[PDB]
Design a protein around this motif. Sequence first.
Motif, short mmCIF file in Angstrom:
data_model
loop_
_atom_site.label_atom_id
_atom_site.label_comp_id
_atom_site.label_asym_id
_atom_site.label_seq_id
_atom_site.Cartn_x
_atom_site.Cartn_y
_atom_site.Cartn_z
N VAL A 1 39.48 35.98 37.94
CA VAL A 1 39.30 35.23 37.16
C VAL A 1 39.38 35.21 36.04
O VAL A 1 39.46 36.59 35.26
N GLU A 2 39.63 34.37 34.68
CA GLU A 2 39.80 34.57 33.53
C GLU A 2 38.36 33.32 33.38
O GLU A 2 38.48 32.58 34.05
N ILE A 3 37.61 33.87 32.07
CA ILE A 3 36.93 33.52 31.69
C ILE A 3 37.30 31.94 30.76
O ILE A 3 37.86 32.17 29.43
N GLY A 4 37.51 30.91 31.23
CA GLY A 4 37.34 29.83 29.83
C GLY A 4 36.47 29.83 29.75
O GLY A 4 34.96 30.14 30.00
N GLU A 5 36.11 28.28 28.82
CA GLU A 5 35.00 27.93 28.26
C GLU A 5 34.68 26.50 28.46
O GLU A 5 35.54 25.22 28.17
N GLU A 6 33.96 26.71 29.32
CA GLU A 6 32.90 25.88 29.88
C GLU A 6 31.90 26.42 30.62
O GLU A 6 30.45 25.69 30.78
N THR A 7 32.02 27.45 31.18
CA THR A 7 31.01 27.99 32.52
C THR A 7 29.39 28.12 32.22
O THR A 7 29.95 28.97 31.00
N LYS A 8 28.97 27.77 32.87
CA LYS A 8 27.25 28.52 33.67
C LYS A 8 27.80 30.03 33.52
O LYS A 8 28.53 30.27 34.50
N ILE A 9 26.63 30.93 33.50
CA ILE A 9 26.72 32.26 33.86
C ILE A 9 24.96 32.78 34.20
O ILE A 9 23.73 32.09 33.44
N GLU A 10 25.22 32.98 34.98
CA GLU A 10 23.87 34.08 35.16
C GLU A 10 23.73 35.80 34.55
O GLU A 10 24.69 37.00 34.67
N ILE A 11 22.22 35.84 34.59
CA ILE A 11 21.69 37.16 33.55
C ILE A 11 20.41 37.13 35.04
O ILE A 11 19.28 36.28 34.80
N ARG A 12 20.13 38.32 35.80
CA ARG A 12 19.91 37.84 36.51
C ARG A 12 18.28 39.44 36.46
O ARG A 12 17.67 39.82 37.21
N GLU A 13 19.22 39.84 35.42
CA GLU A 13 18.03 41.65 35.86
C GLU A 13 18.21 42.30 36.29
O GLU A 13 17.44 42.65 36.74
N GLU A 14 19.42 42.37 37.01
CA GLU A 14 19.61 43.27 37.68
C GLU A 14 20.45 44.49 37.41
O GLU A 14 20.76 44.40 36.37
N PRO A 15 20.35 45.33 38.32
CA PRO A 15 20.96 46.72 38.25
C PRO A 15 21.86 46.17 38.43
O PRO A 15 22.73 45.79 38.14
N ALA A 16 23.30 47.48 37.13
CA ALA A 16 24.21 47.60 36.96
C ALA A 16 25.28 48.72 37.83
O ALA A 16 25.48 48.73 38.21
N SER A 17 24.44 50.25 36.30
CA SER A 17 24.26 51.35 35.86
C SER A 17 23.72 51.96 36.42
O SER A 17 23.29 51.71 34.87
N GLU A 18 23.38 53.03 36.94
CA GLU A 18 21.93 54.01 36.12
C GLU A 18 23.38 55.01 35.60
O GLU A 18 22.30 56.03 35.18
N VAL A 19 24.37 55.96 36.27
CA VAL A 19 25.08 56.66 35.54
C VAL A 19 27.15 55.88 36.10
O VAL A 19 27.20 54.85 36.59
N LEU A 20 27.34 56.67 34.85
CA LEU A 20 28.92 56.20 34.90
C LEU A 20 29.60 57.43 33.68
O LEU A 20 28.89 57.56 33.04
N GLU A 21 30.45 57.66 33.53
CA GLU A 21 31.50 57.80 32.41
C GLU A 21 32.18 56.19 31.74
O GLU A 21 32.71 55.83 31.65
N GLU A 22 31.89 56.75 30.54
CA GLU A 22 31.40 55.03 29.62
C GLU A 22 32.12 55.50 28.57
O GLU A 22 32.96 56.70 28.14
#
Lengths: 726, 726
Positions: free
Chosen positions: B162-183
Motif C-alpha cells: 500500500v501507499e499511505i494517502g492522507e485520510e486513513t485511521k491508524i492503530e497503535i496497539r502497544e504491541e511488540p515490534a522487534s526486540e532484536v534487529l540490525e538497525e
Amino acid sequence: MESNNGIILRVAEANSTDPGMSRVRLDESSRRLLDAEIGDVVEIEKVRKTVGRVYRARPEDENKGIVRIDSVMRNNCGASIGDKVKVRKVRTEIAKKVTLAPIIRKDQRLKFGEGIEEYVQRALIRRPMLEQDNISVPGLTLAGQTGLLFKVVKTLPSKVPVEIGEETKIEIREEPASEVLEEVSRISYEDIGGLSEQLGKIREMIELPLKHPELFERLGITPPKGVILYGPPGTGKTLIARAVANESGANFLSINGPEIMSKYYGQSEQKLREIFSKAEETAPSIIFIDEIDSIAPKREEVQGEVERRVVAQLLTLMDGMKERGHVIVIGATNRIDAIDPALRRPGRFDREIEIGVPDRNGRKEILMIHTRNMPLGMSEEEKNKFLEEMADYTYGFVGADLAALVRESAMNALRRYLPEIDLDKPIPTEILEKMVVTEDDFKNALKSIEPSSLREVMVEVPNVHWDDIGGLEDVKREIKETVELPLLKPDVFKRLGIRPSKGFLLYGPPGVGKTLLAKAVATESNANFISIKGPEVLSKWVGESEKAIREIFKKAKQVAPAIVFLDEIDSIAPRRGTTSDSGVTERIVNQLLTSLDGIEVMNGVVVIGATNRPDIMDPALLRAGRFDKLIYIPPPDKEARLSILKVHTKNMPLAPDVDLNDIAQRTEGYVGADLENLCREAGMNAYRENPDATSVSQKNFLDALKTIRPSVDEEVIKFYRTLSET
Amino acid sequence: MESNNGIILRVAEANSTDPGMSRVRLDESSRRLLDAEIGDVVEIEKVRKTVGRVYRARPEDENKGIVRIDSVMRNNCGASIGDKVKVRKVRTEIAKKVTLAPIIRKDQRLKFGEGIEEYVQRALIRRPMLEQDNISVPGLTLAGQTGLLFKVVKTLPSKVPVEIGEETKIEIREEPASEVLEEVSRISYEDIGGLSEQLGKIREMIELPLKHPELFERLGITPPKGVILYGPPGTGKTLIARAVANESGANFLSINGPEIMSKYYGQSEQKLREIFSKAEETAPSIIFIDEIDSIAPKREEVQGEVERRVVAQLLTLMDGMKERGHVIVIGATNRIDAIDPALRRPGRFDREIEIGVPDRNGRKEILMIHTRNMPLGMSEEEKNKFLEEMADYTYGFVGADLAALVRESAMNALRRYLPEIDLDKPIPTEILEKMVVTEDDFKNALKSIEPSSLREVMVEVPNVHWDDIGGLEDVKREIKETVELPLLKPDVFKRLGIRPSKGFLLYGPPGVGKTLLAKAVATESNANFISIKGPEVLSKWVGESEKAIREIFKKAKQVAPAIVFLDEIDSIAPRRGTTSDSGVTERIVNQLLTSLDGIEVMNGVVVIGATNRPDIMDPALLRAGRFDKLIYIPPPDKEARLSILKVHTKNMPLAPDVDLNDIAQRTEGYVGADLENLCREAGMNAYRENPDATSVSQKNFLDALKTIRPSVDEEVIKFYRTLSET
C-alpha cells in the motif's frame, strides 16, 4: 511548577535570606490569584502532605510566576526545584506554649544554654509553628552556635498548628529527640553564594544529567555522560557537587585522589571499583572524582603504569554502565590543561563547566550565606549594612576566603568579648546578648587578606556614555559605525558585498584617557568590558602564560558578546627588541594574530587596540586583517578642553567664582586624563572643613595651573602626523 | 554501474539522506530503460525474493548503472549495497487502516502510544509502504536519540502492499515490534559522509574476506591481516569500524584493553584467547582493538612483564589465523609511531590507514545525518536547512563536537520550551508539535565549544583565479609555465635535456596579496593546497612538532598532486637568532632543508617560497637546487591597479558617477591590501556610515582617500629591487 497559579505555585530559591523564615515573597498580581492581602498566613501543602504555613509578603524583582522560598521550609517539606503544591488561605491562631527539643544527632550533647531571651524571643516575632514539624531560627555566629533545629514534641494547643506572637513562653527542653528529617548540614543551591547566572548556568546544566528523577527519569533524549569543573575553588568545589546531590535526592559519594594514592595494586582499584559498582546498585547516587587531574594528568610524563591503568580503568567502568542505573561520574579540576585525552573523548566526559571567581555580585551573595549564621546583616538588624560596601574591600577573593574573612570577623569578636569575660563550662545566656558583631570586625578582618591566584581578565560594564567624555566627536561618531553596527546589522554587509574589519587601533598622545574611550564604547554596546593592560601582559609574561593570554579571547568567545580591548600590548614587540633581539615578532605577538585572524570578522567579540606610541610596534598589527583601521586620537582643542572641563568638573559643587571660558584659555596642553586631575587638584587646594560653599575657586585653579606642566608640543604632535605618512 | 540499466539494476546508497528514504533517486535513462518517467510509484523485488515499494525521483550526478537508495528499505529487506534488484512501476494502492509498533529495545516500555497525532497523522506524506513493512520516521526530542523506527504488524488490506494517502485511521496497539534487529541506529556507511576514498578502500578489504558475488579466486592481492586508524578519536574513528561490520553483515567484537589489562598473567590471556576463539566459530568475523595504542606502546619506554606478554599474546593471535577462515583485525590509535615494530610490519598489520578531518563540506554532510532526526523540515528563519549556511562558519571540528554542538542546540531550544511548560508523567502530542529547531540555539551552542584541533593542517583547493588579481602579465604567464608544466610536460623536458625543477621563491612588498598568488595558480593546477606560515610553524614549535613539518610534505605527498606554499618563513630563522644564537643557522631550517631535499617533484608537490626580505635567512633556501627561480613582486601600477579595483567594484552595487581611472591615478604608494580595504571603506561611507539606501559616489572614494594614507615608500620599493640584485 505552574498550574495557572492560586493553587499550584512554582517554587524558587530566595535571593535574600528573608526576615526569619515564614516570611515568603509573592507578587501583587500573584497575590490576587489566591485572593488575600499581604501579612496573611497561607499554608502550602504538597506530596506526602508534609506542610508548613508562611506569610504573604512583598516581591522585589520577582517575575509573576515564581515564589521565593527558603530551603529550610523546602527541606522540611522536601521540595525539589519547580515542584507543584497546594496552597490555600488558612486561619492561623495564637500559640500558648510550644515544647521543643534539640536534635541530638547534630548537637552531640553540647548546648544546655537557656535561649528564652535569644532563640525564643527571636521566635516570638510572628513565626507560625507546626506540631511534629522541625523548624530553625538562624543567627548567632559560630561559638559552636548556629540556628538550631527544634522539632516540636508537643504544643500546648495540642494538635493545632498555631502562630507565636510576642506573649507566649516557648519551652526549651534540651531533652534528646530523634526524627527522620535530614541534617540540614547537607546543603541547598541557595547555600552556594556563587552568582546568579553562573550558578543558574551550572544549575540547569547540572540539572539535565539528572533532570529530575520523579516524573521523568528517561523517556526521550538521553544523558550526556559526565561533567567537568574548572578554575580555582569558590565557596567550594565539593560543595557544588554536594548541593546537587542532596536536593536531587541522590546519594553523595566523595571520591578523591589521595585515597587512590593511599593503597596500590588492586587495593584501591578494587575499593574504587566496588564503590563505583556499589553506587549504581545503591542508586540514585552521585559519583564525583575531584583530583582526577592528579591521577590522570597523563601526557606519559608520569610513571607507574600500574597507576595509569587504574584511572584508565575507572574510565572503562563508566561505559560498563548502561546509563540505566541513573548515576553520573562528575569530574572536577583546576585546569583543563591537565586532562589526559582519555578524559577528553566523549563517552567519558563530553561536558565542560568553567567555575569562575564570582564578581562583586557573587561576593555580595556570599555575605548573605555568612550572615545567615550570624547577626549584623542587611535588613537583618534594622540598621542597614549595604552589601556593596563590604564588597568594595573584596577583590577577586572567593567564598573560602570570605568565610575565612568572616571567620576572623567573628574570631576577633570572640577574641575581644570572651577573653575579657573569659568563660566557664556552662554557656551563659548573657554572653549572647552582649555578643554584637561590629563594623570594625570587618575592618580588623580585612587587615589580613591576600590574592592566591594569577590574574585573568574579567567581564564588566561601566556607566560611561558619549556625554561623559567631551570633544573628538569625529572619531566618536565613527566608533558607532565601527562596532555597534556589525552587531546590530550583520545581514546588511552581505547585501553590500562589503566585508567589515575585525578591529581598529587607537593612537594619539600618551594617556589621553584611552581607557575611557574603551569604557565608553563598552557601556554603549551593553556588553562585557575586557581590557588587557600592559601589567597584565607583564604578569602573564613572567609565568610564561602567553598561552593563557589567548584564552582571554577564548573567554571573550564563550562569554560573547563582549569587547576585548588591548591596551599598550604593542610594547611587547619592541620589549625585548623591535628588530634588535627579535626581527618582527615574538611568540607572544603571533598569538594575537592567531586568535584575531582565526575568528570571523562579525562575532560577539569586538577587538580594539590602543597604542599611544604606535611606531615602536612591529609591522604585524599594521598589515591587513591585523587591525586594519588606523584611528588617530588628536589632542583636545580649546572647545573640547572647555567641553571636557565642564563635564568632569560639575560632578561636584561649582560656583561662578571659576568660569569655563577663562580656564579654557589657561589649558591648551592637557588631555582627558590630565584635565580631570586639574579639577580634583584645584578642589584639593580648597577645603570644606573650613567653610566653603563650592569645591572650586579661580585662585585654586591658578594654583593647580602652576603645578601641572603643558607637556604637549607641536613636535610630539608631529611624530604622529609624520608617522601616519610613514 | 551494473550490467543492465533496465529492470535489473545494482543498488547504491543515497549520498544525501534527504526526505527520500521512501523515495528513490532514479536516473533519467535508467527510468526510460525500465519504463515511463518521473511521477510513478514503483515496486522493487530483489535477492531473497523480498519486496518493497517507493517513489522514484530526479537525478543530478547519477549514472545509469546506479540507483541511490536508503539503508532503511535495504535493511528492512536486509539487503546490502551492490545487490541486484528488480524494479517496475505498479498501481498506487491505499490503506483503510494501518498498524505501527515501536521497538522494544528502543522503548523498554517508555512510550505507551501517545504521539499518534504528531508523528503518524503528520507522517501521512504519500510515502509508499509495504505489508509488514519496517518504516523509520524522524522527529521527537534530541540530545542524541536517533530516528524513530516502526514495524508494521498489520495493514487492514489483507497481505498487500500500500501507499499511505492522507485520510486513513491508524492503530497503535502497544504491541511488540522487534526486540532484536540490525538497525539504522546501529550505524551504516551512510551515517559517515566524511569517508570518500578511504571508505572505498575498506570495501575491497571487508568484502573479499566476507567474499562477495564478484570475486573468490582473488587474483593477486591477499586476505590482509589487520588495519590501523589515525587521528583524534571519538567522532567516526570508533564508529567507522563498527560500521564496516554492520554493513558487511559479519560478526563484530569490540575489544577494550584496560579491561583486559585489568587481569594479569593467565586471566587476561584466556580472555584474549576467548575473544579470538569467539571469532573462530564465527569465522569470518571482525576483530577490533581500539586500545592497541595502550596495549603495545612499547618502544622501550615502559617496562614490566605484563605489556610484553599481552602484546605477545596479541602477536600470537596474528599466527592463529587459518587464512581460509580469515577474520579482520581493525585498530584505532592517534599515530603509527605509538605502536610497536612487530605490529607495524606486514604479516600482522599490512594495512595502515589515515583517517583525516572533515572539510566545511565534509562537516556539512555530517549535519544532515543529525538534521535527519531534527524537526522543522526546512528553515526560512535565517539559515536554510540546505545546510551550506550552517556549515561554513566554524574553522571546523570533528563530528563529535558537531554532535555535542547540535546535541546542546536542541537542548538550548528545550531550555526555552520545556522549563516553562515542564511536563507530567505523559508526554502529549501538542508539546512535540509546538517545538521546532532554531539556528540561534546552534549559535548560542556555538559559543559553548572548544577547539578540539590541537596541531594539524587541513588542506583544500581555492577558488582564486588570475582574474581575482591582475597586473604583471609577465609574472602571470611565468607562474603558469613554472607550476603547471612540470605536471603536464615532464616528458617534453627529458628528451630535450631539461629536468623538472625544484622550486621558486616569491618576494616583494608585504600585503600585496601575495598569499592569493599561490592560491591563484593552485586553482589552475587543480591540486591540493598547503600553507606554511609562522603562526602555524610556531604552533609546531610550541608543541615541538617539528617532526610534523616533515609530515606535512608526506601528507601532501599521499594526497598529491598538491602545492606547498612557504610564506613568513622569514620569521622562522631570525627569531631563534639566525645571527644571534648561531652564525646563519637554526634547527628548523634543517627540518625544511632535510625535508625539502628528501621530497621530489614527480610526487605531485610544487615547492613555493614567499619572502618579504630574501637576505636574513640561510643561503640554502636561497641557493638554487632548493629555490631556483627568483621572482620580485613590484607594486601595483595604475593600469593594473585599475583592473584590480574593477575586480573589487563588481562585488558590490555601483553607480556611474564614480570612475576608477581618475582615483586610481590619484593613488600612489599603495599595495593591493590598502585598495581592497579602500573600496570597502568607501562603500561604508555611502550606504551605512551615512545611513542611506544608495549606491556609492565619487565623494566616498574621495572620503576614503582622506582615510587611506601611503604605506609603501617608493624608495624602499627600489631597495627591495637593489636588495635582490645582491
